[PDB]
């Protein structure tokens, strides 16, 4: 049945809970971002109300074929009225499209609801400056401190001068880069615009990247393989059987495979700085794996909430087990207690 951390009281709305048929009482579902464990369960049989962004109605249309009439895209930054509640969608900082969501109750209760997010300080000086939050339905995907990473700017920095320095040694390499669902594009389009090349992808993949509203995307990717020296690929195809075969498909062109895995965390992040990385090499063949995250690290998520002064912390992540759980609410006194709220 629908977890009540995915119902927000005194209306009728949840959020990302598409995956429990009608829920009842339910007159408007809201969804954070396009990820699957979000959307799972939308079609184009769906028939309610669903409130999103537009880059998330753009790809709900053209990915899943939802019809138009029950897609309901809201700018960013601007009071709007849903079903008779003031409500407000901020920039999440996570995958293109994902939001924050802000209600107003009727009562004078006001929730936030971060989706999917990697805070930032930029997100202290957006509407949530101007009052006070009481509720907060906060992504806890990395609440530990164990979990650190690098800015995604020093994680892009190491990808386009490593990328630059392998081809001008071997102008005879390829550079390969994993996908497995939006988010990230920053990785790929970086190291293609250091070696000026196109993106090459599948139509699917393509299709996908059309959807998000990025500047000159036209000029950034192509579905002609031949005509590129970056290929995106998906995850499962990101080890040395898989690039072993890609390699054989293109003709002698190439002869020597750089690729890039961006994974979240991985236990060398506790050890080992980002100038420290080094690859998996077999033969011709080697694979980096570099900490680029789309979700706060344990500090990032600390710094926010500190800020935030909630009256209540609800988790949206790692509530399946009691251990989980009770970590996090010790975690969140501490911070209580620590900052005097
Ligand atoms: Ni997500």
């Known amino acids: 049945t629908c977890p009540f951390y995915k119902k927000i009281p005194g209306t009728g709305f949840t959020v990302d809970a598409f995956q429990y048929g009608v829920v009842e009482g339910c007159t408007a579902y809201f969804l954070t971002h396009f990820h699957s464990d979000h959307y799972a369960g939308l079609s184009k049989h769906f028939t309610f109300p669903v409130y999103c962004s537009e880059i998330t109605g753009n790809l709900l249309k053209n990915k899943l074929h939802v019809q138009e009439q029950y897609i309901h895209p809201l700018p960013l930054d601007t009071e709007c ?46 509407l949530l400056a101007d009052q006070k939050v009481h509720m907060l339905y906060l992504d806890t995907t990395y609440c530990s401190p164990e979990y650190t990473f690098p800015s995604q700017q020093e994680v892009i920095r190491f990808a386009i001068n490593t990328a630059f320095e392998a081809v001008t040694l071997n102008p005879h390499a390829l550079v390969v880069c994993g996908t497995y669902s939006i988010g990230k594009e920053k990785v790929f389009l970086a190291i293609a615009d250091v070696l000026g090349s196109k993106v090459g992808m599948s139509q699917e993949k393509y299709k996908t990247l059309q959807c998000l509203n990025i500047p000159e995307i036209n000029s950034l990717i192509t579905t002609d393989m031949c005509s590129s020296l970056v290929h995106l690929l998906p995850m499962m195809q990101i080890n040395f059987k898989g690039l072993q075969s890609h390699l054989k498909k293109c003709g002698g062109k190439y002869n020597q495979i750089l690729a890039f895995r961006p994974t979240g965390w991985t236990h060398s992040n506790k050890f080992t700085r980002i100038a420290d990385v080094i690859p998996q090499t077999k033969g011709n063949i080697s694979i980096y794996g570099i900490p680029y995250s789309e979700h706060s690290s344990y500090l990032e998520m600390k710094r926010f909430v500190q800020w935030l002064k909630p009256q209540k912390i609800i988790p949206t992540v790692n509530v399946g087990t009691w251990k989980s759980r009770s970590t996090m609410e010790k975690y969140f006194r501490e911070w209580k207690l620590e900052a005097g709220y």
Do not use: Q, W
């Open 81 to 126: 009225i849903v079903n008779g509640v003031k409500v407000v969608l901020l920039d999440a900082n996570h995958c293109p499209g994902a939001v924050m969501i802000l209600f107003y109750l009727p009562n004078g209760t006001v929730i936030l609801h971060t989706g999917d997010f990697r805070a930032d300080p930029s997100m202290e000086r957006s």
